[PDB]
Design an enzyme around this catalytic site. Structure first.
Site, PDB file in Angstrom:
ATOM      1  N   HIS A   1       0.804  -1.233   0.000  1.00 25.85           N
ATOM      2  CA  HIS A   1       0.000   0.000   0.000  1.00 25.85           C
ATOM      3  C   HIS A   1       0.843   1.293   0.000  1.00 25.85           C
ATOM      4  CE1 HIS A   1       0.773   0.616   4.308  1.00 25.85           C
ATOM      5  NE2 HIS A   1       0.199  -0.522   4.641  1.00 25.85           N
TER       6      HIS A   1
ATOM      7  N   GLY B   1       3.450   5.375  10.405  1.00 25.82           N
ATOM      8  CA  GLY B   1       4.775   5.338   9.829  1.00 25.82           C
ATOM      9  C   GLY B   1       5.563   4.117  10.200  1.00 25.82           C
TER      10      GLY B   1
ATOM     11  N   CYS C   1       4.534   1.032   9.519  1.00 24.63           N
ATOM     12  CA  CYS C   1       4.309  -0.015   8.525  1.00 24.63           C
ATOM     13  C   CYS C   1       5.624  -0.470   7.917  1.00 24.63           C
ATOM     14  CB  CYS C   1       3.354   0.480   7.442  1.00 24.63           C
ATOM     15  SG  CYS C   1       1.663   0.172   7.933  1.00 24.63           S
TER      16      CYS C   1
END
Ligand code: OZI
Length: 301
Positions: free
Chosen positions: A41, A143, A145
């Protein structure tokens, strides 16, 4: 002696963390040999958060759209592909800090360490478990991820988790390093909710065995139970069913302490009934379920 929630030393993983930027979006990537793995993503836009067509979005990207930074170094992307929900970016440089590693998909109840990272930089390490409902109870800010979960057995890092998202209850969902989600979640911002969570019964029993090993005996009783009768009680406390594999798996700790598995199950039945009446077990006033039978053997003996 002593008993702590112990994470693995994070150094082998630190050497692999990088920053991946696509557009205005930045997150963490995992740099192993000449490939950087990260959540796909990163290629989404604000408008495309609900029903991204990842195949369509990726066909429109050229390698030069991906900014990868390892420290002060920008890595040059020379190829890109998607595997399930993980993006794999080919880079011109193999990571000199690549450890011995393997990718493993774990089962609920398994534990692992998480290296929480922001902008490619490690912030901290903690120990986690895959819950029965396929979420993890992590500590993640925006942030984070691309942070990964791992075990280190011998000198080989087994990567088992990549963080992708937070659900509305504040628990976390992610994939294995092949990009397959744990649980029924998808990398879209549509409404998703975690199943009802349950306590990992075999880990509770393992921790009570660790307590006996550290000399704590006050919760033992003269009773034993049948596997079937125990599971009828446990389901009533939102405990997971205890299977014969679980019984086999506790075999060693049962041997080491002299207490049969179904005798310890009788002690767990009673503790669910009475609570701890102010007492603690290995320092906790709740029943700990994020230590596996395997974790208990390596930290106590
Ligand atoms: C983990 C992280 O760094 N985040 C970046 C934004 N984000 C997501 C972006 C796009 C998609 Cl498709 C998904 Cl599933 C996540 C992470 C996140 O948890 N987003 C919040 C959500 C809002 C609704 C559902 S998830 C955070």
């Amino acid at each position: 002696s002593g008993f702590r929630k112990m994470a693995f030393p994070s150094g082998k993983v630190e050497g692999c963390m990088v920053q991946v930027t696509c557009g205005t979006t930045t997150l963490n990537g995992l740099w192993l040999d000449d490939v950087v793995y990260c959540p796909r993503h990163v290629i989404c836009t604000s408008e495309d958060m609900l029903n991204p067509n990842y195949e369509d979005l990726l066909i429109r990207k050229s390698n030069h759209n991906f900014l990868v930074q390892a420290g002060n170094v920008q890595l040059r992307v020379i190829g890109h592909s998607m595997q399930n929900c993980v993006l794999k970016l080919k880079v011109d440089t193999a990571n000199p800090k690549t450890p011995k590693y393997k990718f493993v998909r774990i089962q609920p109840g398994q534990t692992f360490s998480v290296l929480a990272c922001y902008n490619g930089s490690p912030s901290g390490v903690y120990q986690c478990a895959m819950r029965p409902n396929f979420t993890i109870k992590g500590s993640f800010l925006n942030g984070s991820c691309g942070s990964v979960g791992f075990n280190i057995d011998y000198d080989c890092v087994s990567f088992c988790y990549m963080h992708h998202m937070e659900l509305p209850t504040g628990v976390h969902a992610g994939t294995d390093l092949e990009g397959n989600f744990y649980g029924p979640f998808v990398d879209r911002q549509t409404a998703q909710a975690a199943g009802t969570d349950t306590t990992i019964t075999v880990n509770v029993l393992a921790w009570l065995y660790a307590a006996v090993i550290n000399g704590d005996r006050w919760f033992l009783n003269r009773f034993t139970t049948t596997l079937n009768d125990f599971n009828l009680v446990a389901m009533k406390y939102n405990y997971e069913p205890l299977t014969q594999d679980h019984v086999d798996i506790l075999g060693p700790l049962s041997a080491q302490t002299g207490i049969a598995v179904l005798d310890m199950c009788a002690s767990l039945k009673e503790l669910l009934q009475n609570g701890m009446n102010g007492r603690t077990i290995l320092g906790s006033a709740l029943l700990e379920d994020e230590f596996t039978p395997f974790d208990v053997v390596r930290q106590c003996s």
